[PDB]
Amino acid sequence: GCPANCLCSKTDINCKKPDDGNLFPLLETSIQITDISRNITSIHIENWKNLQTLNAVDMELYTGLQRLTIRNSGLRNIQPRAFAKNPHLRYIDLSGNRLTTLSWQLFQTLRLFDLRLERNPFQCSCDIRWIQLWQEKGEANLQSQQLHCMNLDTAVILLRNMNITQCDLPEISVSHVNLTVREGENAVITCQGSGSPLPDVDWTVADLHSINTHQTNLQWTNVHAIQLTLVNVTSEDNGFLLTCIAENVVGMSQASVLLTVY
Amino acid sequence: ESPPVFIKKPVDQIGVSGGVASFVCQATGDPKPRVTWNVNSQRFETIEFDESAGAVLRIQPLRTPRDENIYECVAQNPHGEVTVHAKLTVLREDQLPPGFPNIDMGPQLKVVERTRTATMLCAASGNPDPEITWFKDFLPVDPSTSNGRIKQLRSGGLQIESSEETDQGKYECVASNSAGVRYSSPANLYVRVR
Ligand SMILES: *[C@@H]1O[C@H](CO)[C@@H](O)[C@H](O)[C@H]1NC(C)=O
């Protein structure tokens, strides 16, 4: 079942021998390949100089994954939502690769205990301020790691002391704290996000049984406002928690409104 | 030397709330042009192809009315700059007409050895009888540029005759007609190699 170069356990894939290959491990009965890949809790690539990119397709089979390590290899970038289907993934080691940048949104569904980003060729930018922030608040063990980024003039700055102006977490407001509505009537809530860069904003409210419409009120610079309208409200949505989120490249904030219907 | 011309002009899309809509544009000329679509959001993803001379605007999950709009693809090189438009309409689940495309069977996870045949499955219904097209990794699959290796089946499936490393990816079928457009949930094709 195991691909060559690697040593495959029942719950472990280790590919530490040097390798010119650029294809993520694929064990090899479409029902069986899924079953075998579930039981894997730990993948460890190392010294794969030509492994440049990591797709979501590569990861999606390994649903039981808890530990991913792609160390000291050629890794340039990770496709968005790569780790979507790897919910148990908590230890990630991406040190020693060719990463110039990295998005927090890769890890938005995960509860990372340890994210290792040491010795990558990071370039200073707003795109990586989130790392600086995680580092400050002691998130995912970045606080212990010594991380630098590089300015265009080749200056190497410690990440703690990165200074990018107009590059902050978004702030978020909502028109109502809680919401009371009579069954059959309509209702309007407005959520706005503000900051730099200008955050996207969304009412993550799909599980709602009622009919609902979303409309952008403003997109002036620095404020983004969206207006959730609930039409002909069913009482099946009593006690539902309407949540709005505002994200930019720095991070994410949210607000919650309790909906009560009678 | 030659200014930019559009060989793929994007077409209007009537999508359904919660689902997906794609717009495709692609330009050509000398020098090679760079195309581009016109707030930064996970729901709006631009996928580039052909060294940036083509680009697909993928919008998902669709929200209404907010996403409804005219969108602009702009091809540009040293000799010119040209623009094409396309509209997005987004119907709610309750607002869908009776004959709005519906995916009755979507594609499924498939693994296949290199050089073997692999057929990704799709079956759709609606009125008019919907026309089916495929999308591999958010870009549209073009059976004519194979050539003869990849075949669009009558029933709607996609037949890939000689499996290749490049054929691996996330496939999804798209049923569409005058009433609108509906995406299947996605399915991955893996290609084992030795
Ligand atoms: C994986 O582990 C489960 C545990 O119940 C077992 O039933 C199954 O046979 C195993 N499959 C493989 C591929 O080892």
Author numbering:
A (entry chain B): 31 to 58, 69 to 302
B (entry chain E): 29 to 66, 72 to 227
Study authors write:
At the axonal surface, type IIa receptor protein tyrosine phosphatases (RPTPs) (type IIa RPTPs, for example, RPTPσ, RPTPδ and leukocyte common antigen-related (LAR) in vertebrates, dLAR in Drosophila), are a recently identified nexus for extracellular interactions, receiving signals and transmitting them intracellularly to the cytoskeleton to regulate neuronal extension and guidance, as well as synaptic organization. There are two major neuronal RPTPσ isoforms, sharing a common intracellular catalytic region and an extracellular region predicted to contain three immunoglobulin (Ig)-like domains followed by either five or nine fibronectin (FN) type III domains, in the central and peripheral nervous systems, respectively. Previous mutagenesis and structural studies have demonstrated that the proteoglycan-binding site lies on Ig1 of RPTPσ, and comprises an extended positively charged surface of basic residues101314. Binding of postsynaptic TrkC, is reported to require the N-terminal three Ig domains of RPTPσ17; the NGL-3-binding site has been mapped to the FN1-2 domains.
We had noted that the interaction affinity between engineered proteins used for RPTPσ:TrkC complex crystallization (chicken RPTPσ Ig1–3 and TrkC LRRIg1cryst) was some 20-fold lower following the TrkC 63–77 loop deletion (Kd 4.8 μM versus 216 nM). We determined the 3.05 Å crystal structure of this chicken RPTPσ Ig1–3:TrkC LRRIg12Q complex in an attempt to visualize this additional, fourth, binding site. Crystals grew in a new space group, P1, with three RPTPσ:TrkC complexes in the asymmetric unit (a.s.u.). The RPTPσ Ig2–Ig3 linker (V226-A230) and the Ig3 domain also lack well-ordered electron density in this structure. However, a R227A+R228A double mutation reduced RPTPσ:TrkC binding, as did insertion of the meB mini-exon between R225 and V226 in SPR-binding assays, supporting the involvement of the RPTPσ Ig2–Ig3 linker in the auxilary binding site 4.
